[PDB]
Design a protein that fits this description.
The structure is a homodimer. Chain A is an alpha+beta fold. In chain A, 23% of the residues lie in helices and 41% in strands. Chain A has one domain. Chain A has three helices and seven strands. Chain A is globular, with a radius of gyration of 16 Å. At the A-B interface, strand 1 and strand 3 of A face strand 1, strand 3, strand 4 and strand 7 of B.
């Protein structure tokens, strides 16, 4: 793809346990800012309902593991690590800009993911349960945190 | 609410009512009126006519464009635009345009006819040109 500007049609945030919170988009754009080595800029419009969550993310400079689907909703998510840069609250909606850096899923994800879950002591049905959910959501692995 | 859209067709219309369609790899258009920059359009097309677009950018040529938004089912929105940037690849290029949307003047038909007659046209030539210009809808000489 040769474009530097894309329409964002789905937005999700994933936690450690591979649990997705999806936010319904009013609007969405994401720009590849290579001009500086500044990464990517995501601007979305969502309901005000989530103003506190995102205000707290901004205040703590929370590192967020996000999934962004581009152009058409059936497409495979792109993977970013991001922080909230600015928030604008409106009457029923809010506008949020994120600072994003793209990443590719590592090789041997399935093997590392299993190694992590077993080292956390999971077994049998809880293990199948977590592995399957995590295989789809793809959380950042414990060996990448601090 | 929705401010960012897919751009599915792109055309330039010249003085003569002639449509020049370019097939898109991709396109997005963004409504930035709140800012006051009008709309922002990025497209990827073949780079065969790179020199044509470099020329427009250098001359800051004012282009009368038609953009179909979201679905091909829609009729094109009318823009007056200039080329802001070009990124050239192997056999494609990406172009960004600054655009300002516009509505078609009232009595367009009557003014078109006036111009064609004043330019010496008659008979079959007049009908041919009028029928085409009524489809593409170019800016008139009174500008």
């Amino acid at each position: 793809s040769h474009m530097k500007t894309f329409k964002a049609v789905r937005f999700q945030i994933v936690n450690e346990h591979g649990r997705i919170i999806e936010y319904e988009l009013e609007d969405g754009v994401i720009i590849n800012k290579e001009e500086s080595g500044t990464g990517w800029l995501l601007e979305i419009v969502i309901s005000n309902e989530h103003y506190e969550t995102f205000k707290e993310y901004q205040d703590n400079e929370q590192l967020l593991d996000i999934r962004v689907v581009i152009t058409r909703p059936a497409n495979d998510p792109a993977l970013f690590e991001s922080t909230v840069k600015s928030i604008k609250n409106f009457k029923t909606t809010m506008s949020i800009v994120f600072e994003c850096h793209i990443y590719t899923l590592r090789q041997q994800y399935a093997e590392s993911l299993l190694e992590q879950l077993i080292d956390d002591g999971l077994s049998g049905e809880e293990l199948k349960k977590s592995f399957n959910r995590m295989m789809q959501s793809k959380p950042k692995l414990k060996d990448e945190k601090l």
